[PDB]
Ligand binder design. Structure first.
Ligand code: HEM
Length: 453
């Protein structure tokens, strides 16, 4: 039956916008969803979207005959620096399908055998850093996972070394990228984002975009100077031809892809690794089970590709981390035609819906009563269509899913092979939002098991 859609408190002409005047908007949206249920409208000046939280509705949103990817307001702002790169292009834009076809083979399960050695290079640097800490020191978890994930995509993708583990001050590229993302988040909170009152933030934003483009220049210059032949992402982009069209990407689009991969390659995965260790230190029995599997499987000084694929319980741990805290916590869709959602909510062509992934992942009708518990065994055996969506949906799902999960499986495996962890501060979870999610202030101490590399 057609029903009126729930909607939270409005503030005159500002509509719902003041509800998200917070540094933790996705967490605030989860609270609204707790209060209003599976669907609610959220208006701000000049835009409307509808936040979905149940598998019953999200399964319909994920029907590609009915909905296509939408550029949320956040993506539209991110597009100021990512352009028509893969993540910020419309499905119908020429460069989407073109770049997709050119790059997809670079991200398959098979391409992972190729990247494995270089993933190991950076994982070893992480393990060595932690082996070299003195007794009175600790680990800043999200910070070190970011060093690893950035360096891994730099190296695997572009044969470029960020050398993040040689730095205690974060890489200039990351300083600017984080500030650009912070600006996007602040811009989402403005009534009139084009107001010339914000021309200063715009100045800084453009300076940070220049910094990102300066790094792209260095990556391209290094490629030309090192004068080696590689089959990495950049090589595929410079020479690869779209089999559908028979054209290569233009330099402008390649530049956008480089920045896209550096961002995306690192943000999601670093949060996943940090959430996973967090859950392990809070769920000691699960830790023991991971440690047992690492010790049992990782019998060589460094992991092989085949050994990583045998870390089945580590993979379950990672999926359960993604269930509770999917690190790219939403994605947006638009109605391809006039339709009715859920037998209940009429939509007009172009109307936007937002999939609130953390809420979908707490839907008791799919998962059972215990959704707040960290229980990797969930994945042991058979879950429903579109209940678990940490990598988005359909042909606009993450191109990085296998890359991210191979890396994180490798790294978490090595971490638990080589160390025991202590939650020395009895850390209370604090989730930082930079569009993506990651723990803030999560610290531990590691006690080496003294197993050489
Ligand atoms: C745990 C790690 C990661 C998570 C949770 C994640 C999540 C996502 C999600 C939710 C989307 C869809 C967003 C939307 O519909 O608007 C997406 C798209 C994307 N992901 Fe990831 N991802 C991760 C790792 C990576 C990595 C490692 C790469 C690259 C190396 C990457 C590259 C991309 C790209 C390029 C897209 C756009 C794909 C397309 O539309 O053609 N991702 N990912």
């Amino acid at each position: 039956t057609i029903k009126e859609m729930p909607q939270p408190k409005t503030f005159g002409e500002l509509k719902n916008l003041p509800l998200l005047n917070t540094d933790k908007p996705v967490q605030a949206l989860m609270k609204i969803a707790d209060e209003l249920g599976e669907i609610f409208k959220f208006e701000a000046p000049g835009r409307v979207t509808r936040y979905l939280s149940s598998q019953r509705l999200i399964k319909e949103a994920c029907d590609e005959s009915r909905f296509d990817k939408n550029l949320s307001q956040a993506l539209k702002f991110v597009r100021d620096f990512l352009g028509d790169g893969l993540a910020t292009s419309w499905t119908h834009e020429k460069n989407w399908k073109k770049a997709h076809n050119i790059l997809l083979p670079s991200f398959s399960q098979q391409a992972m055998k190729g990247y494995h050695a270089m993933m190991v290079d950076i994982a070893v640097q992480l393990v060595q850093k932690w082996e070299r800490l003195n007794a009175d020191e600790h680990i800043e978890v999200s910070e070190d996972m970011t060093r690893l994930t950035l360096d891994t995509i730099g190296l695997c993708g572009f044969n470029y070394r960020f050398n993040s583990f040689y730095r205690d001050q974060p890489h200039p590229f990351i300083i600017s990228m984080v500030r650009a993302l912070d600006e996007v988040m602040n811009k989402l909170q403005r009534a009139n984002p084009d107001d010339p009152a914000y021309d200063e933030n715009k100045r800084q934003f453009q300076e940070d975009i220049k910094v990102m483009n300066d790094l792209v220049d260095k990556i391209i210059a290094d490629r030309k100077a090192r004068g080696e032949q590689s089959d990495d992402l950049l090589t595929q982009m410079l020479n690869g031809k779209d089999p559908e069209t028979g054209e290569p990407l233009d330099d402008g689009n390649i530049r956008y892809q480089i920045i896209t991969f550096l961002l995306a390659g690192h943000e999601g995965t670093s949060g996943l690794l940090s959430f996973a260790l967090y859950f392990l230190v809070k769920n000691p029995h699960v830790l023991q089970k991971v440690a047992e599997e690492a010790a049992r499987v990782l019998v060589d000084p460094v992991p092989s590709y085949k050994q990583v694929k045998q870390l089945k319980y580590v993979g379950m741990v990672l999926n359960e981390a993604l269930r509770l805290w999917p690190t790219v916590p939403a994605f947006s869709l638009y109605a391809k035609e006039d339709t009715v959602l859920g037998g209940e909510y009429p939509l007009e062509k172009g109307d936007e819906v937002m999939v609130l992934i953390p809420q979908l992942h707490r839907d008791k009708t799919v998962w059972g009563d215990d959704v707040e518990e960290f229980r990797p065994e969930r994945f042991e055996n058979a879950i429903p269509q579109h209940a678990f969506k940490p990598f988005g949906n359909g042909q606009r799902a993450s191109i990085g899913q296998q890359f991210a999960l191979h890396e994180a499986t490798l790294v978490l495996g090595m971490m638990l092979k080589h160390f025991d962890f202590e939650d020395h501060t009895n850390y209370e979870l604090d989730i930082k939002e930079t569009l993506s999610l990651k723990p803030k202030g999560f610290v531990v101490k590691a006690k080496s098991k003294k197993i050489p590399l």
